[PDB]
Amino acid sequence: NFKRISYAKTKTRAEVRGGGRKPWPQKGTGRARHGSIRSPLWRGGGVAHGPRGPTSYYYMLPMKVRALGLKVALTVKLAQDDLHIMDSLELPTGDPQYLTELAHYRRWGDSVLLVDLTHEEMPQSIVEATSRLKTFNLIPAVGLNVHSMLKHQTLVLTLPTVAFLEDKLLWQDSRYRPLYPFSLPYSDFPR
Amino acid sequence: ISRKWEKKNKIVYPPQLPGEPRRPAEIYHCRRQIKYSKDKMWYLAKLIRGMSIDQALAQLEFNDKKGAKIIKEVLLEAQDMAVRDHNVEFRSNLYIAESTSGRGQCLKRIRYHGRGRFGIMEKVYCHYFVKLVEGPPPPPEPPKTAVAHAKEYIQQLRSRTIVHTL
């Protein structure tokens, strides 16, 4: 939801074309009294309480909460035997069928999330195989998130990624309350 | 719009067995978008309902209503249609099984009134439906007689139980 923007919008009685004049005198006609043909009671009239977009849903959970969520997702995967640690993501070939057959033989779920340490240094073989697949998705370590982890039945992390994740997530437990955004220089951050 | 009445003359029954009885022929026919009121047409369709083909044609020939000349025209072409297409031997051996009218598609027009007022008049149209059946007209039901009234009354006195007990 945080990045959701709804573009739904309707016209109120003020924005519907026309509708200036009183359609007929207040009294004497025997009809119901009306002030405008564009009232929400009329066919073609304005919408009383319709969507008034564009509408933003932005909000931010506390940084510590979002970090804890990642920890929970990793634990759940390990506790349920859905986490596999690899030394590297190098395949012998770039054929997607190899990777598909490998998952079937090792009894991995239908979908597998592949997490590499860095986008630039992803092996070319795994890049070729995953690029041609739909349920086998390759992401960098910076892309790890709860939604992707839950959507994919199996999570595969490289050993360098494991070190990367522990460093970033445990920093949240031992850190001071900030004095200014962490993008600015600190004594001991980054690394 | 619905046009099911014209599709009833296309039903093909399986051949009958040697022992089964002769099946009467049924002929469905109608006329659509007649410039006439269905309420006024209903009195004419009710008149010939149950009559023979030759008796209905005689009653409609001396009626002064406009719908009479139309129904009679629909009956004459349904009679010929029966013998020519539906394998009816005698053209007089037909009677009116069903005959009713239906509302057609109508048009709306303005009727000017005084004081700048107006009404909307419908230009009325109707349908006429008829079903012919081969054979003589079924004999009319005799009026209930005193013997039947008494026989029914005594039957109710014999069917009454002791209520709200064992």
């Binding site: 007929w24 005198p25 009294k27 004497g28 006609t29 | 598609q105 048009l107 709306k108 027009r109 303005i110 004081r115 700048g116 007022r117 107006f118 909307i120």
Partner: peptide
Amino acid sequence: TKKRFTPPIYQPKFKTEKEF
């Protein structure tokens, strides 16, 4: 008592002009 007159309003013509 002030004169009260309600003028008549004609409906749109097209509503009574449609043909088959």
